């Protein structure tokens, strides 16, 4: 097919040899539904700003107001780096000798008298 | 000054390749850091046609191993694809370090503090560190063994830390350096049996190889994504992608739980047989299934007392499973992300975790909040791994750093560079002196600790290293990747020497390292274990591929 | 509102007869809070109905919000044991209480075995020497110890002879598991920051 | 307790879906199959929602039965809030 | 400078449940998130009011970013 | 499908569409019910074996030559 080759094409430019069938399948089918929610938006804007040409600046405001919200990522080092030293200056706890089975307060673990329904 | 990039670093290219070929070697380093910060300032100033431009001329005559980053950038071309990637958003606020001589720093300030180049010469000191050391100009393939990270090969001034690499009962730490919990008395009565083991131990060495015991997955049509063995070779432990812990006996001994809180309050304590008292025979199976991971389980670790399995998954969460009890007791939800790698402590108290989110947690089965966060590297945490007398922890990671942290002060105190692609193993040698890792290039780097320098570098395995251990001598390392070979190194002819210039000029010896070579049937090796008897057991799925 | 048949519209119709089956934001300094984000795209005045507008959208943010916490800090509140429809199936705490009352007799016996110890120690006449002194120092310390205790506690005594609606309560737990559930806040810095707190 | 009393006479009752089929599904996601009755609700929970989609799709067929086409569901999924995809790639 | 007053929401939860008590971390929470909120919302409601060329954040642009990425559907 | 509300499935993988390009795009709906459905296959056992006897590979089964 005409778009499924320029897919297989992006997973070469990728290195990525060896794939399943269905990869390419579900990879347009995420790119279509990724231009079908921008360019629905896109006219959602253009209707607000009132022009029956959805041109380039609807298209431009409907992408980065849909990767404002879908589209994260992992946080940042400046704030993995003060989150570090606000945790690594508490110094470590000691250890009770005999306390039993280490473990949190048990509002914290998964150990409760779990119940079931009687069977009648 | 953006439409002139394509002349001033073709300026700096056109300088280095007419020098003379001592160093020419070592000033090519700043091509790669040097095409990437121009790169990037291009697009974050969106200046796109020049940045595909400017690519497109450059990227050939970046180093081969360089072809990921690479693929990468030449994605990024708008400004807001860079402001969510956050790999190359850390990449264009650090520095990178560019290890170079004096003898070749001398011709690069003087092609650099002239006006003629004022401007890549306003690039180099923006945005790379360069550590100067006094000595000889490196070659071409000792330079080719420590690069190849991003704001890679770190200074000396990091590696001069002072690291306690010694066991515990003048290298040691103290005993209450880190609050170790205590040696009970069935954990001295393990030992007490470790050392029966211990005496039917065979020396290895390059004579004596040791027979490999292949624990094979056969059927294993939900992937295999983890494995631990217990110290003792008494579980095996499975990680699978249909979000399933499998606890397999191997010695002839079933699987039991104890029994339920009625019918252990009815026998009495103060019983010499007390644990055989509770032990329930209703529930003895070969194999016990563990639910409740909503995702592939990607880490496995047994706790050293074979009570309390580990184990992380792709939803975020680190579970602690019970051995008695055959439960789930604990999920750690500190990540987000999904978590790649958790192991305990060798002692059994503390445990880390290293995830997504690119930091290490480190945790004590007391506290549902970790105790330290190790946060500075700039890619995902893929391993992590306790020091055997557990007060310090090397995290491999997918930015091609191994990096040692202290567990007082959550410190990096090692940086080790020098791996192509995201490190994927590592392990430590029983004397706690070397670190050997594995990464995607297939290579295997023998770091010291106490120096902070690579001793070696075995280069023998073709694709990814995804398993190392040392023999419970230290007399060989054992190494398992996707090639489906069990490679044996000489541990011993590996270590037989032990700065200022921060290298050592590493000797190409792998092919006198190479004890053997041992292929699997169509089998990645995913674990390798030494027996205490000093046997290699492995486990991988059989996947007929 | 636009789906006739939506499905968020029977989620909050039924949580709310699940919670009975057990903001208004100040408008001074809410204006001044606009306008300085406004300063950053030219926004320079506001509408005189959007202040009132944005603090009627706050309130139906967060009582989204606690309607959803509250119907999760009441499923804790649960107890199966009064009804007697369900049957207990597997108690993993009494296990883990009746391991931790082993090692605290593994304890006791180690304490035993420390006072037969010292028993053997008492007579110490140049036998042992100092593998004897030092036990009998420890036990004159361990005396000297309980001793004060138990003065603390005589004094206590001549002292004494001289003068003779279950509120369901919303914990941080419950504010985090309504939040990595809905799409917005799961992949956020404000619960990745709120594990820590 | 109408739901308690469904759950108990779901013992002898078969699901459309098996539960070796629902409890894979199940045992996926970590709900581990403690009690069969709790797979056969999960199991007919499920089918009423595949189900309901379905006769709201019949009716708009019935208006403008017999064949169900993705412009039958487009509009039975829309008083959802769902937004169904045409394939268009292949 | 803080637009919700610590009290009113304490009624927020009265009109939910008579009887509910929250802690003093999860009503701060609660504050951080009303205050990313309304920052998220305003900022998003300015691009939609630059684009449709204006100086004025009219509720339309407030309106129109609740219904697309937020679905609340506030009466106007 | 993409649900604006996102309550029904959230983040919940459906396993794709079974598509082809080739596809006939219309089946009777009693096609589907009267043929045979697929064999669950085994479940996971740990067999172990040996890669090497003192230094050599046995040439077994589970070894490739």
């Not at chain 3, 593998?131 to 005594?157: G, H, I, S, T, V």
Request: charged share 25%; glycine share 4%.
């Amino acid at each position: 097919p005409k778009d499924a080759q320029m897919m297989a094409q992006i997973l070469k430019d990728m290195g990525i040899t060896e794939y399943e069938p269905r990869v390419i399948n579900q990879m347009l089918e995420f790119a279509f539904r990724y231009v079908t929610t921008i360019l629905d938006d896109a006219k959602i804007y253009s209707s607000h700003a009132k022009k029956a040409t959805v041109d380039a600046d609807d298209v431009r405001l409907a992408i980065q107001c849909r990767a404002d919200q879908s589209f994260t990522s992992p946080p940042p080092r400046d704030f993995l780096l003060d989150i570090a030293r606000q945790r690594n200056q508490t110094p470590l706890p000691l250890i009770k000798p005999y306390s039993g089975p280490r473990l949190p307060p048990d509002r914290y673990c998964l150990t409760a008298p779990n119940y079931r329904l009687k069977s009648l | 000054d953006p439409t002139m990039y394509e002349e001033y670093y073709s300026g700096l290219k056109h300088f280095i390749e007419c020098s003379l070929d001592c160093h020419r070697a070592e000033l090519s380093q700043l091509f790669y850091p040097l095409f990437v910060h121009m790169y990037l300032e291009l697009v974050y100033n969106q200046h796109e046609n020049e940045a595909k431009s400017f690519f497109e001329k450059f990227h050939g005559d970046q180093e081969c191993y360089y072809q990921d980053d690479l693929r990468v950038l030449s994605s990024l071309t708008k400004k807001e694809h860079m402001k969510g990637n956050e790999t190359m958003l850390d990449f264009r606020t650090s520095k990178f370090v560019l290890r170079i001589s004096r003898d070749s720093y001398q011709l690069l300030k003087r092609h650099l503090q002239e006006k003629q180049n004022n401007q890549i010469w306003n690039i180099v000191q923006e945005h790379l560190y360069i550590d100067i050391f006094d000595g000889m100009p490196r070659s071409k393939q000792q330079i080719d063994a420590m690069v190849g990270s991003l704001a890679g090969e770190a200074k000396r001034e990091a590696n001069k830390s002072k690291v306690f690499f010694g066991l515990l009962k003048p290298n040691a730490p103290p005993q209450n350096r880190i609050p170790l919990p205590e040696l009970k008395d069935s954990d001295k009565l393990d030992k007490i049996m470790n050392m029966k083991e211990t005496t039917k131990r065979v020396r290895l060495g390059p004579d004596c190889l040791p027979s490999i015991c292949f624990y094979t997955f056969l059927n294993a049509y939900q992937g295999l994504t983890a494995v631990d063995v217990t110290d003792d070779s008494s579980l095996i432990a499975g990680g699978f992608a249909d979000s399933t812990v499998r606890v397999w006996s191997v010695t002839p001994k079933k699987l039991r739980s104890v029994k339920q809180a009625s019918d252990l309050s009815l026998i009495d304590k103060e019983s010499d047989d007390v644990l055989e008292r509770i032990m329930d025979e209703k529930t003895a199976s070969e194999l016990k299934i563990l639910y409740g991971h909503s995702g592939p389980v990607y880490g496995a670790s047994f706790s050293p007392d074979r009570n309390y399995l580990l184990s992380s998954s792709e939803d975020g969460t680190v579970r602690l499973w019970s051995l008695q009890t055959f439960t789930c007791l604990v999920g750690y939800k500190g990540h987000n992300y999904p978590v790649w790698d958790t192991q305990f402590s060798p002692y059994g108290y503390y445990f880390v975790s290293g995830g997504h989110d690119r930091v290490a947690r480190l945790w004590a089965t007391d506290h549902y909040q970790p105790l330290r966060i190790f946060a500075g590297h700039l890619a995902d945490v893929n391993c992590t791994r306790f020091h055997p007398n557990s007060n310090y922890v090397a995290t491999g990671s997918a930015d091609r750093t191994v990096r040692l942290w202290d567990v007082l002060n959550g410190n990096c105190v090692r940086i080790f560079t020098g791996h192509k692609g995201p490190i994927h193993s590592l392990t430590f040698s029983p004397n706690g002196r070397f670190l050997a890792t594995g990464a995607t290039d297939g290579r295997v780097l023998l770091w010291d600790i106490g120096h902070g320098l690579m001793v070696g570098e075995l280069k023998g395995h073709t694709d990814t290293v995804c398993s190392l251990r040392f023999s419970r001598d230290g007399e060989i390392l054992a190494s398992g990747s996707m090639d489906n070979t069990v490679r044996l190194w000489d541990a011993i002819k590996a270590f037989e020497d032990l700065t200022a210039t921060g290298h050592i000029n590493l000797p190409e010896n792998s092919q006198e390292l190479l004890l053997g070579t041992y292929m699997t049937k169509s089998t990645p090796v995913v674990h390798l274990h030494f027996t205490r008897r000093n046997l290699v057991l492995a486990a991988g799925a059989y996947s007929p591929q | 509102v636009a789906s006739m048949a939506g499905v968020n519209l029977s989620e909050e119709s039924a949580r709310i007869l699940a919670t009975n089956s057990e903001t208004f934001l100040l408008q001074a300094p809410l204006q001044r809070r606009i306008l300085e984000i406004g300063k950053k795209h030219g926004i320079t005045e506001l509408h005189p109905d959007v202040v009132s507008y944005v603090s009627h959208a706050t309130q139906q943010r967060l009582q989204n919000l606690v309607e959803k916490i509250s119907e999760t800090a009441q499923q804790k509140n649960f107890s199966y044991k009064d009804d007697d429809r369900y049957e207990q199936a597997s108690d993993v705490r009494a296990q883990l209480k009746f391991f931790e009352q082993l090692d605290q007799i593994e304890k006791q016996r180690k304490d035993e075995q420390e006072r037969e110890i010292l028993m053997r120690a008492a007579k110490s006449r140049s036998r042992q020497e100092d593998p004897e002194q030092l036990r009998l120092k420890q036990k004159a310390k361990e005396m000297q110890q309980q001793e004060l205790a138990q003065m603390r506690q005589r004094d206590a005594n001549l002292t004494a002879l001289a003068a003779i609606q279950r509120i369901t309560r919303v914990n941080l737990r419950d504010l985090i598991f309504c939040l990595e559930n809905e799409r917005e806040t799961s992949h956020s810095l404000l619960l990745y920051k709120a594990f820590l707190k | 307790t109408p739901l308690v009393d469904f759950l108990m006479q779901l013992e002898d009752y078969t699901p459309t879906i098996p539960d070796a089929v629902t409890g894979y599904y199940l045992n996926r996601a970590g709900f581990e199959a403690s009690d069969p009755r709790i797979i056969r609700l999960i199991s007919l929970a499920a089918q009423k929602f595949i189900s309901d989609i379905a006769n709201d799709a019949l009716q708009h067929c019935k208006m403008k039965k017999y064949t169900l086409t993705m412009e039958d569901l487009t509009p039975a999924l829309s008083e959802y809030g769902i937004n169904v995809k045409k394939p268009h790639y292949f | 400078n803080q637009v919700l007053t610590k009290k009113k929401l304490q009624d927020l939860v009265r009109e939910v449940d008579p009887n509910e008590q929250l802690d003093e971390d999860v009503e701060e929470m609660l504050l951080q998130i009303a205050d990313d909120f309304i920052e998220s919302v305003v900022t998003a409601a300015c691009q939609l009011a630059r684009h449709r060329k204006s100086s004025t954040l009219e509720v339309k642009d407030v309106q129109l970013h609740l219904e697309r990425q937020w679905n609340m559907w506030i009466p106007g | 499908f993409h649900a604006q509300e996102f309550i029904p499935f959230r983040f919940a993988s459906g396993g794709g569409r079974e598509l082809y390009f080739y596809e006939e795009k219309e089946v009777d709906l009693s096609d589907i019910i009267n043929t045979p459905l697929p064999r669950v296959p085994l479940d996971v056992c740990l067999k172990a074996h040996w890669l090497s006897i003192e230094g050599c590979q046995p040439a077994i089964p589970e070894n490739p030559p």
